[PDB]
Subunit: 182 residues, 4 copies
């Protein structure tokens, strides 16, 4: 996707408006010097009181900033003069378990957390293929981490046999988050 | 809502079965004296190798246990002789924010976590009424906890003016989790 | 941590001048002797402040820390700045389990809050578990790491010895918390 | 740390001959291990296999005591364990360290993943003159509850308070930016 923010010259998103999809060192060249309202459609962004991204800063998040003092957190902060999108570094651990081989059918997506019961999460189907984007996981045949263990690491598993399962049945999954070396 | 567990005399949910919606001190009456498989539709439950909920214990959660050794890892466990539902103590911090007054219209559900942007959560509407089921929250007019603050505590807020907002607009909420003292007493 | 909240209002900014310690709710700071609210210093909170008396108007949440100026809690430069205060009765529930080395809740001890512990050895606890105290939550203790071995359902109460939670030998190496339930009484 | 550490014994309850392992072992009987009686994990986690060359049933060994074969498998086998290898765990974190004095000196505070609305409640009542961001995207604030001047803290080193935009070396609350709607 593309970062999207729109600054308005007046309050309550009125008057002239300018759309920004990248970094802006000087805002007077957009037709809006003293911004009155800001609509953030895809961010986040960081704004600065001076040109060329200097001075006091303020972070914009997705939402509506209808007033001139909405995004500031200190009264002595001057008007918006420069703005740029933030390249957020946020890592997560994701594993996707599919009902049919070759990553088709119904799927369940797990992010970071352990799932002791697949049935409680609304997934009562089989598990024939697994895609691990990140993290180290262990799958189990039965709820509560019972039954045969399946170490699931970063990679693709086109078939249940590819991660050691005789039949395509997985009902619980936990994540290994600790490591006493390296 | 009642708990639901089904026990079978044979593995893979075959043979005679018995459904339990409450505790059973002796599985001898249910016709399934040595359960071969167990189906947990609503739990969790805890099983016991002896009657009257004694001996080694096994925790059953929602799902399918198709073998008589599936709910345990020890090989010394005896057959299932009694079961009872677990009265789980799991607390969550819940706040509901509605679009129209009197708790109507589009609603947004927040549990435990902070939300710095209502728009990122799929809620781009106004906030005219609030229902706080549990927890201590602070609502804000603008994303990133900016603007006027509104202390949202346990109870109902039928109008925006009831939680201190003449303007029905909330875009970020954080939960107060820490507290450096303990209020003793009763009321 | 104390038995009462604690906040201090200073007449001037940066915690200078006359100070006024508050240990409870105050509906009107002015009539109590506070000439001005120059700065606010929270040592046992949190608190909520209000622009007007009777806890009305704009609200300011004060947490433990330093609020050295008016612009630290409000963007409007009013002469009142802060007219009332009261301690917040926070509703923050946690699930606490404490496992002791010796019976009757003595010896080495390890406390777990909310989260699951798949390995006691990785958490620094390599000793036996003879007594257990469940403050809140529903827990399952296992005798081996990775939630393997004999199971012990640990619920709200006290366990003086291993036999009280059905353990033949005081050995526990992993505990997980039960967080879901599909039936309501 | 540095190297993994598993120790496998011939008899149960960690009795008999002991063969230490600091890496992968395709075949346990060739390293002098007759029978896998008990397993003690001092630095892991490890993954064991019922057959050689890391094939067959899998057993996850975490730090702790595994005194009998019942602890990792329910099927009695003559050879309960044939191969062992350390797991290369993929576990990402977001750490930021804030130091009292410039150039990363004095008292310090580390924050992992979670937001901190009050440094005083966290046990840190000092100034913040230098910041080291090893991972994640953070916004530091002058006052508790994410108030006052904001400072965007990104991956890198800030040796002085002015390096992250603070003419006054004061930080009392930090939150992490977790979401992004582009790229």
């Amino acid at each position: 996707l593309n970062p999207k923010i729109i600054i308005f010259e007046q309050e309550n998103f009125q008057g002239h408006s300018h759309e920004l999809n990248g970094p802006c060192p000087n805002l007077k060249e957009t037709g809006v010097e003293k911004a009155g309202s800001v609509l953030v459609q895809a961010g986040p962004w960081v704004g600065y009181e001076q040109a060329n991204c200097k001075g006091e800063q303020f972070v914009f998040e997705k939402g509506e900033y209808p007033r001139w003092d909405s995004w500031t957190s200190s009264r002595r902060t001057d008007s918006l003069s420069s703005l740029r999108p933030i390249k957020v570094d946020s890592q997560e651990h994701k594993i996707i378990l599919y009902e049919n081989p070759n990553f088709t059918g119904k799927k369940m997506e797990i992010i970071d957390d352990d799932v002791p019961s697949f049935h409680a999460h609304g997934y009562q189907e089989k598990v024939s293929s697994v895609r691990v984007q990140s993290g180290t996981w262990v799958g189990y045949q039965y709820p509560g981490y019972r039954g045969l263990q399946y170490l699931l690491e970063k990679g693709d598993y086109k078939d249940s046999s590819d991660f050691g399962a005789p039949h395509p049945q997985v009902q619980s999954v936990r994540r290994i988050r600790d490591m006493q070396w390296h």
